[PDB]
Write a protein that binds this ligand. Structure first.
Ligand SMILES: CCCCCCCCCCCCCCCCCC(=O)OC[C@H](COP(=O)([O-])OCC(O)COP(=O)([O-])OC[C@@H](COC(=O)CCCCCCCCCCCCCCCCC)OC(=O)CCCCCCCCCCCCCCCCC)OC(=O)CCCCCCCCCCCCCCCCC
Ligand SMILES: CCCCCCCCCCCCCCCCCC(=O)OC[C@H](COP(=O)([O-])OCC[N+](C)(C)C)OC(=O)CCCCCCCCCCCCCCCCC
Ligand SMILES: CCCCCCCCCCCCCCCCCC(=O)OC[C@H](COP(=O)([O-])OCC[N+](C)(C)C)OC(=O)CCCCCCCCCCCCCCCCC
Ligand SMILES: CCCCCCCCCCCCCCCCCC(=O)OC[C@H](COP(=O)(O)OCCN)OC(=O)CCCCCCCCCCCCCCCCC
Ligand SMILES: CCCCCCCCCCCCCCCCCC(=O)OC[C@H](COP(=O)(O)OCCN)OC(=O)CCCCCCCCCCCCCCCCC
Ligand SMILES: CCCCCCCCCCCCCCCCCC(=O)OC[C@H](COP(=O)(O)OCCN)OC(=O)CCCCCCCCCCCCCCCCC
Ligand code: SF4
Ligand code: SF4
Ligand code: SF4
Lengths: 176, 49, 156, 381, 43, 55, 311
C-alpha cells in the first residue's frame, strides 16, 4: 500500500557504469529535454483568439447579477429579504414598502458588486427565481461606484440578459 | 507530398474570404484568417462561424 | 490646422505604442494571482497582445493588484506604485482589490485598493475569470487609445 | 560582522536574512501580509455563510478545504452524506489534488528557472477548472461541497469528460517528468537541499509530503480515513532522504495515484441523491420548495437562520495536498460558530523554514520555499 | 431515473504509471559513434 | 489533429511518445454542450409511511 | 563607399537584433504550447517597433549614481564593443580583413566585462554591485575556456585568420574532429552572454532608464547573434564558391539562425544553475577536459603529419 520513490540502487557492472558516464559526457537526458521542447514546437498551440473566440462555459456560470420578470412584465422580486439574509458578504441591501396596488415590492435593491463574492447563494435562496447571477462576465468598469448596482441597473440587466438567463435556467433547473 | 495540400489550403483560405482584400481585412481585424461555415448573423453585423 | 493634424497623428502613434506594448507588474496577493496565471497560460495567452509575463516593477506600464490588500502591505503597494515610471496604470482585479470584498468588514483589510493607489480599471469577480481579466486589460488598452496628451498640449 | 538582507514584498512574503557571505545563518519569515481576519468573520456568519471562506484559504485546494469544513460540521451534526455525495467529494478532492500538485511542481520549477512545464501543465489545469465551472458555476471557488453532501448533482456528460481527461493526463505527467526528473540541473538544485529528519518533522508539526519525503509512512486517507477512501485502492509514495527531490517525486507520484483514484471513482459512482435527506440540514429541492409547506418553511429557515449545530468542539483533519488540513470548530448551540480555528500545513512548514535553510545558500532558499508548498492565504488566514 | 452514471461496461482502462520509453543507444555504442566521428574528422 | 504526417512523425520522434493517441487538445470526443434533461432520484426519506422524523 | 559598407554592416545588425526579440517571443511562445505576439503587427511584425517606441518615451527612472562617467560610458562601451565584433567576421568576405581576426574578437570580447563592472559600480545599490561582480566573475571564468578551445581549433586552422577558417573546412565541417570542443564552446558562449541556463541576472543594470536599458539589451543580442555567427564560421563553416558569394552568405545565415534558435530552444528547456554550480561546471568540468583536448590537439597534427599551413 506504499511505494518507495528514489530507493533504486544503480548497477555496478561495466555496462551500466559506462551508460551513466555516457549520459554524463554526452548530455543525453538534456537532449531528451530539448527533444520534448522541440516536440511542443511542432504542435498546435492551445491559444484561442479572444475577443473573437471565447472560452467554453456552462449554464451554471455565475457572472453578473440580474433581476428577472414574470412573462407579464411583473418583476419576480417580492421583498422577502432571503438573499440579503444569506449573502455571505452582505453585499445586498433591500428596502421595501407596499406600492400603489398593494404589492409587496422593493424600493431599494442594491448589490455592491465590489463586496460580492459571486457564490450564488442569492439565486439559490430566492424562492421565486428573481435574482439570478447570469452569464455576463465582461462588465469591467473604469470607476469604483459603477460597480455599485441599484435596482434600476439590475432590472436593466434582467431586461438585457433575459433571453439567455431563461434558457440557462431551463437547461439547469432540473438539477436544482 | 503533403506540403502541397498545406499550400493549397492556405491559398483557398485566401480565396475563401473574398480574395486578397477580404483576406487582409480579416487578417488585420482578427489576427486569424481561417474560414468557417457561416452559422449566422445578428441584427448588428456580427457574423458567427 | 496643420499642427493639430500633426499632434493628432503623433498621439495616435504614441498611444498605439503604449497600448500595444503594455508591461504588467502583477501583485500576487491572493487567489486572483492564480487567475492572472491562467490569463498568462497558453489558452488566453497575454503575451500575444504584447502584454509580457512578469516584467520588473521599475519598467512596467500597469500595476495589476490581484488579491486582498491588507493593512500590513498597503505601504508596500504604494511604494511599488511610486517606483513605477510614468505612464503607469493600475488595474484592480477581483472584489477584495475593488472594495474589500469578502473581507470588507475586516479589521485588517484595506477596503479597496483605490484608498491607496489611483485605479484605472475595475475588474469584478471572485475571482474574475482569466477571460474577464483579459477583457479588463483590453478595456485599459482602449482607454490608452483615446488619450489626448499632445492634442491638449498643443491646445494649452 | 555578517550580512543582513531584507527580501521584502516588492502569495507574498517578507524575509529577513542573516547571511555569512553565501551561506544562510538565519531566516526570519515576516508574514501577516495576507491576514484578513477570516476566522473572526466566521464567528458572525452562519455555517453555510462561513463555508465560502474555506475556498479562499488554500486557494489552489478549494474543494479540499470545503470538504474538511463540511466534515467538521457533519461530525458535529451527527449526520452523514449520501454515498454518491461521498464518491463525488473524493472524486473532486483528487481532481483538487491534481490542481494543487500541478501548481506546486510547476511554480517550484518556475522559481528555480524551468519556466516551460508551467505553460504545459496549466492547460490541463485550465481543463480541470472547466470541470469545476461545469459542476458548480465558478472556476475556482465553487462553494460546492457543503455540510450534508454537495450542492448540486453532476451535470450529464461530466463524467465522460473526466474520463477523457484522466485517460490523457498520465502522458502529461510523463512529459513533465521527462523535463525535470532525470534532468541534471533540476537534480543539482534539489538533491542536497533541505534535508529534514523524521523526528524533527514529527516535532515541527509537519504533515503530508513534508513527513512522507522523510520516510514516515503516514497518510490520513489510509490511517484516519474519510468519506470513501477506505473503498478506493491506491498507494502512498514514501521518500528516502527528506530533500526537495524526494518531495518532488512524492508529488509526481501523488498525481499518478490521484489518476488511479479518479479512474476508480469514475467506475464506481453509485446512483442516488447528493444531499442528506434531512431537510432540517440540507435544503430541499426547488420543485418541492415551491409545492410543500414544510419544505418552504425549511428553505426559509435554512437560508435565513441556518441549521443549529449542537454544542461541542471538534478537530476534523483531512489530507489536503499540502498536508493535514484541520478545522477546530466550536459550536455553542446556535446557527453560527462560536470559534473556528483553521489549522493549515503551510503555517508549520513555514515555521520550519528556518531549520530547513540552515547552512544553505540564498538561491537554495527559493528551492526550500518551493518544496514546502506555501500558499500564504492558508498561512495568514 | 436519468442521472450522471458510468456506462454498463465501465470506462476504459486508464494509464497511471510511468512510461519513460528508454530510447537511445547503449553507452558503448554512443562512445563508439563519437570516437568514429572523431576518426573521420581526423582523417 | 490537423498536422501532416511529416510534422506528426517529427513530433512523435522528438517526444518519443505516441502523441496522437493522447492529445492534450480536445476534439469531437467530448460531451455535447446541450444535454437531455435529467430525472434526479429521491432519497431514502421520500416515503409516505414509516417515515417519522423522530426515527 | 567604404562608409556605405560600414553602414550596411551596422544598420542591419540593429534590425536583426530588433527582430530577434520577436523571434524569441514567438519561439518561446510555440515551445510553451502558446502563441507569441500576433496582434500588434501582421503576425506580430510590429512588436519590436512598438516596444522600442514604448521604451523611448517612458519617463526616465532618474537614478542617483556613484559616477556620471561610468554611468554614461557603460552603454557606450557595450554598444561599441557589440558593433565592432562584426568587422573581421568573414561572411564570406569581412569588412576589415585582418591577419589576427580571431585574436581580435577574443580581445574585444574580453573587454566587454567593463560594461558590467562600470554599470554595477555606477549604481548606488549594493545588491546591483554584487550581481554585477558575480556576472563579471562568470564572464571572466568562461573566457578561459573560450580562449583555450579557440586555440585548439586554430591549431587545425593554421593561423589566426578568419578567412582561412573557411578554407580549413572545405572538405569537412570542423565540428567532426572537434565536437567535444564544439559542445564546450557552445555552452561557454551560452555562459558568456548571461544566457539561460546561466542567467543569474534574471534570477545588474536596474538603475538605467528604459532607453539605455534597451541599449544594453540590444548590445546583448548583438553579442548573441555575433557569437552564433562566429560559432557557425568556426565549426560549421560552409561551402564558398568565389564567383557566387551568395551561396556562402545564405548558408552561414541559415546555420546562424538555426544556432540562435538553438539558444532560444535551450532557454525554454532548463532551470537555472546556482552560481557555485556553474563555477563548478567551469573550473572542475569544462576546464580539465579543455586542457586535455588542448594537449590532444597540439600533439595530434604532429602525430598524423597534418600540420596546417602557416599562410
Ligand atoms: C521550413 C521553411 C518553410 C517551408 C514551408 C513549411 O514548412 O510550411 C509549413 C508546413 C505545414 O506544417 P504542419 O505542421 O504539418 O501544418 C499543418 C496545418 O494543418 C496546415 O495549416 P492550416 O491547415 O491551418 O492552413 C492554413 C495555413 C497553411 O499553411 C501554410 O500555408 C504554410 C506556410 C507556407 C509559407 O496558412 C496560413 O496560416 C497562412 C500563413 C501565411 C504566412 C506563412 C509564413 C510565411 C513565411 C515567410 C515570410 O510544413 C510542412 O508541410 C512540413 C515541413 C515542410 C518543409 C519544406 C522544406 C523546407
Ligand atoms: C528612433 C527610435 C524611436 C524614437 C521615438 C519614437 C518616434 C516618435 C518621437 C516623438 C513622440 C512624441 C513626442 C514625445 C512623447 C510625448 C508624450 C507626452 O506625454 O507629451 C506631453 C508633453 C507635455 O504635455 P503637457 O503639457 O500636456 O503635460 C501633461 C503633464 N502635466 C500637465 C502634468 C505637466 O508634451 C511635450 O513634452 C511635447 C513634446 C513634443 C511634441 C511633439 C513634437 C514633434 C516630435 C517629433
Ligand atoms: C556548436 C554546435 C552545437 C554543439 C553541441 C551543443 C548543443 C547541445 C546542448 C545541449 C543542452 C545543454 C544545456 C546546458 C548543459 C550544461 C550542463 C552540462 O552538460 O554539464 C556538463 C557535464 C558536467 O557533469 P555532470 O554535472 O553532468 O556530472 C556530475 C559531475 N561531477 C561528478 C563532477 C559531480 O559534463 C561535462 O562536463 C562533459 C563535457 C563534454 C565532454 C565531452 C567528452 C567527449 C568524449 C571524450 C572521450 C571520453 C571517453 C574516455 C576516454 C577515451 C579515450 C580514447
Ligand atoms: C505631417 C504628417 C505626418 C506626421 C508624422 C507621422 C509620420 C508617420 C508615423 C507612423 C504612422 C503614424 C500613425 C500610427 C497609427 C495610427 C492609427 C492607429 O493607431 O491604428 C490602430 C491600428 C491597430 O488597431 P487596434 O486598435 O490595435 O486593433 C486591434 C485589433 N484586434 O494600428 C495598426 O494597424 C498598425 C499601426 C502601426 C503604426 C505605424 C508603425 C510604427 C511607427 C514606425 C515609424 C517610427 C518607428 C521607427 C523605428 C523605431 C526603432 C525600432
Ligand atoms: C530589411 C527589411 C526590414 C523591414 C522591417 C519592418 C518589417 C515589417 C514591416 C511592416 C509590415 C506590414 C505592416 C502593416 C501594418 C498595418 C497597416 C494598416 O493598415 O494600418 C491601419 C492604420 C489605421 O488605418 P485607418 O485609416 O484607420 O483605416 C481603417 C479603414 N476603415 O494606419 C496606420 O497605421 C498608418 C500606416 C502605417 C504604416 C506603417 C507600416 C510599418 C512600418 C514599420 C517600420 C519599418 C519599415 C521597413 C523599413 C526597412 C525596409 C525598407
Ligand atoms: C572609455 C573610452 C571609450 C570606450 C569605447 C571606445 C573604445 C573601446 C572599443 C573600441 C576598441 C578599439 C580597438 C582598436 C584596435 C583593435 C586591434 C587591431 O587593430 O587589430 C587589427 C589589426 C591587426 O591585424 P593585421 O592583419 O596584422 O593588420 C593589418 C595588416 N595586414 O591592426 C590593424 O589593422 C591596425 C590598424 C591601425 C591601428 C588602429 C588603432 C585604433 C586606435 C587606437 C585605439 C582606440 C581606442 C582606445 C581606447 C580603448 C579602450 C579603453
Ligand atoms: S453571489 Fe453571493 S456574495 Fe454575491 S450577492 Fe449573491 S449571495 Fe451575495
Ligand atoms: S430577490 Fe428573491 S430572495 Fe431577494 S428579496 Fe427579492 S424575492 Fe426575496
Ligand atoms: S476577490 Fe476573492 S477570489 Fe479574488 S483574490 Fe479576493 S478573496 Fe480571492
Amino acid at each position: 500500500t506504499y511505494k518507495y520513490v528514489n530507493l533504486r540502487e544503480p548497477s555496478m557492472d561495466m555496462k551500466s557504469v559506462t551508460d551513466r558516464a555516457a549520459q554524463t559526457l554526452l548530455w543525453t537526458e538534456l537532449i531528451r529535454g530539448l527533444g520534448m521542447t522541440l516536440s511542443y514546437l511542432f504542435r498546435e498551440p492551445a491559444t484561442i483568439n479572444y475577443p473573437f473566440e471565447k472560452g467554453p462555459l456552462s449554464p451554471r456560470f455565475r457572472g453578473e447579477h440580474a433581476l428577472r420578470r414574470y412573462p407579464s412584465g411583473e418583476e419576480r422580486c417580492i421583498a422577502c429579504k432571503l438573499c440579503e439574509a444569506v449573502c455571505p458578504a452582505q453585499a445586498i441591501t433591500i428596502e421595501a414598502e407596499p406600492r400603489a396596488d398593494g404589492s409587496r415590492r422593493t424600493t431599494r435593491y442594491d448589490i455592491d458588486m465590489t463586496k460580492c463574492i459571486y457564490c450564488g447563494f442569492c439565486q439559490e435562496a430566492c424562492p421565486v427565481d428573481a435574482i439570478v447571477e447570469g452569464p455576463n462576465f465582461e462588465f469591467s468598469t473604469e470607476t469604483h461606484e459603477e460597480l455599485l448596482y441599484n435596482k434600476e441597473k439590475l432590472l436593466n440587466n434582467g431586461d438585457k440578459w433575459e433571453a439567455e438567463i431563461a434558457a440557462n435556467i431551463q437547461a439547469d433547473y432540473l438539477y436544482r | 507530398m503533403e506540403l502541397l495540400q498545406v499550400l493549397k489550403r492556405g491559398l483557398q483560405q485566401v480565396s475563401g474570404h473574398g480574395g486578397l482584400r477580404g483576406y487582409l481585412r480579416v487578417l488585420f481585424r482578427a489576427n486569424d484568417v481561417r474560414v468557417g461555415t457561416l452559422v449566422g448573423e445578428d441584427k448588428y453585423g456580427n457574423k458567427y462561424y | 490646422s496643420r499642427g493639430e493634424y500633426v499632434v493628432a497623428k503623433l498621439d495616435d502613434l504614441i498611444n498605439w505604442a503604449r497600448r500595444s506594448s503594455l508591461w504588467p507588474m502583477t501583485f500576487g496577493l491572493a487567489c486572483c494571482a492564480v487567475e492572472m496565471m491562467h490569463m498568462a497560460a497558453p489558452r488566453y495567452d497575454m503575451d500575444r497582445f504584447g502584454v509580457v509575463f512578469r516584467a520588473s516593477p521599475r519598467q512596467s506600464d500597469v500595476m495589476i493588484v490581484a488579491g486582498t490588500l491588507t493593512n500590513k502591505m498597503a505601504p508596500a503597494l504604494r511604494k511599488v506604485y511610486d517606483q513605477m515610471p510614468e505612464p503607469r496604470y493600475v488595474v484592480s482585479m477581483g472584489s477584495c482589490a475593488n472594495g474589500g470584498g469578502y473581507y470588507h468588514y475586516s479589521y485588517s483589510v484595506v477596503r479597496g485598493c483605490d484608498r491607496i493607489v489611483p485605479v484605472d480599471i475595475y475588474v469584478p469577480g471572485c475571482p474574475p475569470t482569466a477571460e474577464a481579466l483579459l477583457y479588463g486589460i483590453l478595456q485599459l488598452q482602449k482607454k490608452i487609445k483615446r488619450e489626448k496628451r499632445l492634442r491638449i498640449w498643443y491646445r494649452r | 560582522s555578517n550580512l543582513t538582507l531584507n527580501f521584502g514584498p516588492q502569495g507574498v512574503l517578507r524575509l529577513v536574512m542573516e547571511l555569512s557571505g553565501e551561506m544562510v545563518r538565519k531566516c526570519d519569515p515576516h508574514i501577516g501580509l495576507l491576514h484578513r481576519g477570516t476566522e473572526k468573520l466566521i464567528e458572525y456568519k452562519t455555517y453555510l455563510q462561513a463555508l465560502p471562506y474555506f475556498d479562499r484559504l488554500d486557494y489552489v485546494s478549494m474543494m479540499c478545504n470545503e470538504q474538511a469544513y463540511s466534515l467538521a460540521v457533519e461530525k458535529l451534526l451527527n449526520i452523514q452524506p449520501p454515498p454518491r455525495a461521498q464518491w463525488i467529494r473524493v472524486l473532486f478532492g483528487e481532481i483538487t489534488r491534481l490542481l494543487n500538485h500541478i501548481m506546486a511542481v510547476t511554480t517550484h520549477a518556475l522559481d528555480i528557472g524551468a519556466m516551460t512545464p508551467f505553460f504545459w501543465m496549466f492547460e490541463e489545469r485550465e481543463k480541470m477548472f472547466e470541470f469545476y465551472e461545469r459542476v458548480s458555476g465558478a472556476r475556482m471557488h465553487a462553494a460546492y461541497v457543503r455540510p450534508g453532501g454537495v450542492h448540486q448533482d453532476l451535470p450529464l456528460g461530466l463524467m465522460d469528460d473526466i474520463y477523457e481527461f484522466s485517460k490523457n493526463f498520465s502522458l502529461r505527467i510523463d512529459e513533465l517528468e521527462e523535463m525535470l526528473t532525470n534532468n541534471r540541473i533540476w537534480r543539482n538544485r534539489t538533491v542536497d537541499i533541505g534535508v529534514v529528519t523524521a523526528e524533527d518533522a514529527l516535532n515541527y508539526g509537519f504533515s503530508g509530503v513534508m513527513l512522507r519525503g522523510s520516510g514516515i509512512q503516514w497518510d490520513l486517507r489510509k490511517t484516519q480515513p474519510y468519506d470513501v477512501y477506505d473503498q478506493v485502492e491506491f498507494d502512498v509514495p514514501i521518500g528516502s532522504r527528506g530533500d526537495c527531490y524526494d518531495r518532488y517525486l512524492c508529488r509526481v507520484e501523488e498525481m499518478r495515484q490521484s489518476i488511479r483514484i479518479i479512474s476508480q471513482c469514475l467506475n464506481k459512482m453509485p446512483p442516488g441523491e447528493i444531499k442528506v435527506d434531512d431537510a432540517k440540514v440540507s435544503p430541499p429541492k426547488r420543485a418541492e420548495m415551491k409545492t410543500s409547506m414544510e419544505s418552504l418553511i425549511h428553505h426559509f429557515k435554512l437560508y435565513t437562520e441556518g441549521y443549529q449545530v449542537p454544542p461541542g468542539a471538534t478537530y476534523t483533519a483531512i489530507e489536503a495536498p499540502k498536508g493535514e488540513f484541520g478545522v477546530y470548530l466550536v459550536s455553542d448551540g446556535s446557527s453560527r460558530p462560536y470559534r473556528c480555528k483553521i489549522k493549515a500545513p503551510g503555517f508549520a512548514h513555514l515555521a520550519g523554514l528556518d531549520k530547513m535553510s540552515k547552512g544553505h545558500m540564498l538561491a537554495d532558499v527559493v528551492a526550500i520555499i518551493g518544496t514546502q508548498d506555501i500558499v500564504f492565504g492558508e498561512v495568514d488566514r | 431515473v436519468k442521472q450522471d452514471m458510468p456506462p454498463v461496461g465501465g470506462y476504459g482502462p486508464i494509464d497511471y504509471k510511468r512510461n519513460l520509453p528508454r530510447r537511445g543507444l547503449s553507452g558503448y555504442s554512443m562512445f563508439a559513434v563519437g570516437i568514429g566521428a572523431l576518426l573521420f574528422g581526423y582523417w | 489533429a490537423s498536422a501532416t504526417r511529416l510534422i506528426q512523425g517529427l513530433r512523435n520522434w522528438a517526444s518519443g511518445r505516441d502523441l496522437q493517441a493522447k492529445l492534450q487538445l480536445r476534439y469531437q470526443e467530448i460531451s455535447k454542450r446541450t444535454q437531455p434533461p435529467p430525472k434526479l432520484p429521491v432519497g431514502p426519506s421520500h416515503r409516505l409511511s414509516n417515515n417519522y422524523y423522530c426515527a | 563607399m567604404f562608409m556605405i559598407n560600414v553602414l550596411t554592416l551596422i544598420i542591419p545588425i540593429l534590425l536583426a537584433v530588433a527582430f530577434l526579440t520577436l523571434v524569441e517571443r514567438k519561439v518561446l511562445g510555440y515551445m510553451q504550447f502558446r502563441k507569441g505576439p500576433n496582434v500588434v503587427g501582421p503576425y506580430g511584425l510590429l512588436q519590436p517597433i512598438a516596444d522600442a517606441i514604448k521604451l523611448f518615451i517612458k519617463e526616465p527612472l532618474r537614478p542617483a549614481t556613484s559616477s556620471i562617467s561610468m554611468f554614461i560610458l557603460a552603454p557606450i562601451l557595450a554598444l561599441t564593443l557589440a558593433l565592432t565584433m562584426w568587422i573581421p567576421l568573414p561572411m564570406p568576405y569581412p569588412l576589415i580583413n585582418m591577419n589576427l581576426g580571431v585574436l581580435f574578437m577574443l580581445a574585444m570580447s574580453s573587454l566587454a566585462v567593463y560594461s558590467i563592472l562600470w554599470s554595477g559600480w555606477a549604481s548606488n545599490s549594493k545588491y546591483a554591485l554584487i550581481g554585477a561582480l558575480r556576472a563579471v566573475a562568470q564572464t571572466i571564468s568562461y573566457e578561459v575556456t573560450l580562449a583555450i578551445i579557440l586555440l585548439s581549433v586554430l591549431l587545425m586552422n593554421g593561423s589566426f585568420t578568419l578567412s582561412t577558417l573557411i578554407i580549413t573546412q572545405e572538405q569537412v565541417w570542423l565540428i567532426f574532429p572537434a565536437w567535444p570542443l564544439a559542445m564546450m564552446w557552445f555552452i561557454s558562449t551560452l555562459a558568456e552572454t548571461n544566457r539561460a541556463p546561466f542567467d543569474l541576472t534574471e534570477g545588474f543594470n536596474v538603475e538605467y532608464a528604459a532607453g539605455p536599458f534597451a541599449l544594453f539589451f540590444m548590445a546583448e543580442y548583438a553579442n548573441i547573434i555575433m557569437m552564433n555567427i562566429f560559432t557557425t564560421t568556426l565549426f560549421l563553416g560552409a561551402f564558398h564558391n568565389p564567383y557566387m558569394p551568395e551561396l556562402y552568405t545564405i548558408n552561414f545565415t541559415i546555420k546562424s539562425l538555426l544556432l540562435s534558435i538553438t539558444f532560444l530552444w535551450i532557454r525554454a528547456s532548463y532551470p537555472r544553475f546556482r552560481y557555485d554550480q556553474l563555477m563548478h561546471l567551469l573550473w572542475k568540468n569544462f576546464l580539465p577536459l579543455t586542457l586535455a583536448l588542448c594537449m590532444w590537439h597540439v600533439s595530434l597534427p604532429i602525430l598524423l603529419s597534418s600540420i596546417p599551413p602557416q599562410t
